[PDB]
Design an enzyme around this catalytic site. Structure first.
Site, mmCIF file in Angstrom:
data_model
loop_
_atom_site.group_PDB
_atom_site.id
_atom_site.type_symbol
_atom_site.label_atom_id
_atom_site.label_comp_id
_atom_site.label_asym_id
_atom_site.label_seq_id
_atom_site.Cartn_x
_atom_site.Cartn_y
_atom_site.Cartn_z
ATOM 1 N N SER A 1 45.432 84.742 -60.431
ATOM 2 C CA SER A 1 46.090 85.554 -59.413
ATOM 3 C C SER A 1 46.893 86.721 -59.968
ATOM 4 O O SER A 1 47.417 87.507 -59.172
ATOM 5 C CB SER A 1 47.013 84.703 -58.542
ATOM 6 O OG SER A 1 46.350 84.264 -57.378
ATOM 7 N N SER B 1 51.010 84.886 -53.708
ATOM 8 C CA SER B 1 49.705 84.801 -54.361
ATOM 9 C C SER B 1 48.598 84.507 -53.364
ATOM 10 O O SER B 1 47.597 83.883 -53.706
ATOM 11 C CB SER B 1 49.696 83.758 -55.475
ATOM 12 O OG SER B 1 48.364 83.498 -55.875
ATOM 13 N N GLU C 1 38.179 86.057 -54.353
ATOM 14 C CA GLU C 1 38.744 84.718 -54.242
ATOM 15 C C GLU C 1 37.764 83.814 -53.492
ATOM 16 O O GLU C 1 37.160 84.238 -52.494
ATOM 17 C CB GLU C 1 40.096 84.746 -53.521
ATOM 18 C CG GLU C 1 41.226 85.369 -54.286
ATOM 19 C CD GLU C 1 41.693 84.521 -55.464
ATOM 20 O OE1 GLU C 1 41.173 83.404 -55.649
ATOM 21 O OE2 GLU C 1 42.598 84.976 -56.197
ATOM 22 N N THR D 1 52.360 85.581 -61.134
ATOM 23 C CA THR D 1 51.663 84.492 -61.802
ATOM 24 C C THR D 1 50.195 84.417 -61.392
ATOM 25 O O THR D 1 49.733 85.070 -60.457
ATOM 26 C CB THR D 1 52.335 83.139 -61.520
ATOM 27 O OG1 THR D 1 52.463 82.934 -60.103
ATOM 28 C CG2 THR D 1 53.704 83.085 -62.165
ATOM 29 N N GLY D 2 49.464 83.591 -62.144
ATOM 30 C CA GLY D 2 48.091 83.213 -61.885
ATOM 31 C C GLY D 2 47.871 81.780 -62.340
ATOM 32 O O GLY D 2 48.376 81.360 -63.387
ATOM 33 N N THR D 3 47.160 81.000 -61.541
ATOM 34 C CA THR D 3 46.809 79.640 -61.908
ATOM 35 C C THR D 3 45.387 79.382 -61.425
ATOM 36 O O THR D 3 44.990 79.853 -60.357
ATOM 37 C CB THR D 3 47.807 78.613 -61.328
ATOM 38 O OG1 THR D 3 49.137 79.152 -61.361
ATOM 39 C CG2 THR D 3 47.789 77.322 -62.131
HETATM 40 C C1 LIG Z 1 40.721 78.334 -55.188
HETATM 41 O O1 LIG Z 1 41.317 78.915 -56.343
HETATM 42 N N1 LIG Z 1 41.863 78.118 -57.113
HETATM 43 C C2 LIG Z 1 43.086 78.183 -57.363
HETATM 44 C C3 LIG Z 1 43.921 79.259 -56.813
HETATM 45 O O2 LIG Z 1 43.923 79.522 -55.620
HETATM 46 N N2 LIG Z 1 44.672 79.926 -57.678
HETATM 47 C C4 LIG Z 1 45.649 80.928 -57.312
HETATM 48 C C5 LIG Z 1 46.627 81.426 -58.301
HETATM 49 O O3 LIG Z 1 46.544 81.930 -59.408
HETATM 50 N N3 LIG Z 1 47.573 81.044 -57.463
HETATM 51 C C6 LIG Z 1 48.879 80.973 -57.620
HETATM 52 C C7 LIG Z 1 49.497 81.759 -58.676
HETATM 53 O O4 LIG Z 1 49.614 82.990 -58.505
HETATM 54 O O5 LIG Z 1 49.890 81.173 -59.715
HETATM 55 C C8 LIG Z 1 49.589 80.147 -56.849
HETATM 56 C C9 LIG Z 1 51.085 80.209 -56.934
HETATM 57 S S1 LIG Z 1 51.441 78.940 -58.097
HETATM 58 C C10 LIG Z 1 52.367 77.738 -57.345
HETATM 59 N N4 LIG Z 1 53.647 77.989 -57.010
HETATM 60 C C11 LIG Z 1 54.394 77.029 -56.411
HETATM 61 O O6 LIG Z 1 55.581 77.271 -56.108
HETATM 62 C C12 LIG Z 1 53.850 75.783 -56.123
HETATM 63 O O7 LIG Z 1 54.547 74.905 -55.569
HETATM 64 N N5 LIG Z 1 52.582 75.506 -56.434
HETATM 65 N N6 LIG Z 1 51.801 76.480 -57.057
HETATM 66 C C13 LIG Z 1 50.405 76.181 -57.406
HETATM 67 C C14 LIG Z 1 48.974 79.083 -55.957
HETATM 68 S S2 LIG Z 1 47.279 78.882 -56.353
HETATM 69 C C15 LIG Z 1 46.769 80.560 -56.342
HETATM 70 C C16 LIG Z 1 43.596 77.151 -58.286
HETATM 71 C C17 LIG Z 1 44.956 76.813 -58.395
HETATM 72 S S3 LIG Z 1 45.051 75.553 -59.567
HETATM 73 C C18 LIG Z 1 43.360 75.538 -59.842
HETATM 74 N N7 LIG Z 1 42.746 74.710 -60.722
HETATM 75 N N8 LIG Z 1 42.722 76.439 -59.078
#
Ligand SMILES: CO/N=C(\C(=O)N[C@@H]1C(=O)N2C(C(=O)O)=C(CSc3nc(=O)c(=O)[nH]n3C)CS[C@H]12)c1csc(N)n1
Length: 265
Positions: A42, A100, A140, A209-211
């Site tokens: 992200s 995000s 996405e 951030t990105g996850t």
């Molecule tokens: C469908 O796509 N898959 C995703 C996804 O949507 N990723 C996106 C990404 O980079 N995102 C970010 C962010 O910006 O960090 C976020 C914000 S990170 C976060 N902040 C919190 O406060 C909290 O309680 N939980 N989380 C997770 C959510 S996932 C979305 C994913 C997430 S974990 C994984 N194995 N896949």
């Protein structure tokens, strides 16, 4: 002693860590795997919101875009609340930067390059700032799921940080346009447990951030010292050995962020 402390990070958390901090006039560049490819995840919504601020006048932000529950194929904490309302281009920029929001990203991508040209459009924006290295290829969610070693949907800590020094410190955006982008990531709600937790509270931290799959945890930041001197930090990590469902360790990004603070003191 940076690489020494950073390998121990990689060992303890069993992860691949990439860090790059651009050199200031007084501070050398810090770099660890700086030029290896990590997945955007992200983090790309930060320089994408910049593409949409650049490409159009501040009037564009009031163009209401109508989207549906079909258009939500990705985590969308803030866009999911307007299944029929539609939102201003300024409010989507809010979602995908600060929450995000995944669907905002695809609309913002659609607004930048049309139905089919969005990813190539945003990638060209990155080129337009000197990043000849990063690419977006998917929308996405699929951009978060590419196999390790794959170049698609990847930036580098060096490339993305150099993109970030231009957006917030440089002249990529005019003062007012830049004003909102910076304000957005300063309000960002996601990076509390990452680079923010690594610097002292009297530092000013503005991050996105990105996850993603394969343990992917990314944070890209601009930080400000008590004497105001600015620093761009980009922290990227993946744990591609545990498979696609490997857990990101957010504490990693915090940990690495306390070392570059340990040298930017
Ligand atoms: C469908 O796509 N898959 C995703 C996804 O949507 N990723 C996106 C990404 O980079 N995102 C970010 C962010 O910006 O960090 C976020 C914000 S990170 C976060 N902040 C919190 O406060 C909290 O309680 N939980 N989380 C997770 C959510 S996932 C979305 C994913 C997430 S974990 C994984 N194995 N896949």
């Amino acid at each position: 002693d940076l690489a020494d402390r950073f390998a121990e990070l990689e060992r303890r958390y069993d992860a691949r860590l990439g860090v790059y901090v651009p050199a200031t006039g007084t501070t050398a560049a810090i770099e660890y795997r700086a030029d290896e490819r990590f997945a955007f995840c992200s983090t790309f919504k930060a320089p994408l919101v910049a593409a949409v601020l650049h490409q159009n006048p501040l009037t564009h932000l009031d163009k209401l875009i109508t989207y549906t529950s079909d258009d939500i194929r990705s985590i969308s904490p803030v866009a999911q609340q307007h299944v029929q309302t539609g939102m201003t281009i300024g409010q989507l920029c809010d979602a995908a930067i600060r929450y995000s929001d995944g669907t905002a990203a695809n609309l913002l991508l659609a607004d930048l390059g049309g139905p089919g040209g969005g990813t190539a459009a945003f990638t060209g924006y990155l080129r337009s700032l000197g990043d000849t290295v990063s690419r977006l290829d998917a929308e996405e969610p699929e951009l978060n799921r590419d196999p390790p070693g794959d170049e698609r949907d990847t930036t580098t800590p060096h490339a993305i940080a150099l993109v970030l020094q231009q957006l917030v410190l440089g002249n990529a955006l005019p003062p007012d346009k830049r004003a909102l982008l910076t304000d957005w990531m300063a309000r960002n709600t996601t990076g509390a447990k990452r680079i923010r937790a690594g610097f002292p509270a009297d530092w000013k931290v503005i991050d996105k951030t990105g996850t993603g799959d394969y343990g992917r945890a990314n944070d890209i930041a601009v930080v400000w010292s008590p004497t105001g001197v600015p620093y761009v930090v980009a922290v990227m990590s993946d744990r591609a050995g545990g498979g696609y469902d490997a857990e990101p360790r957010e504490a990693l990004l915090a940990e690495a962020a306390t070392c570059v603070a340990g040298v930017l003191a």
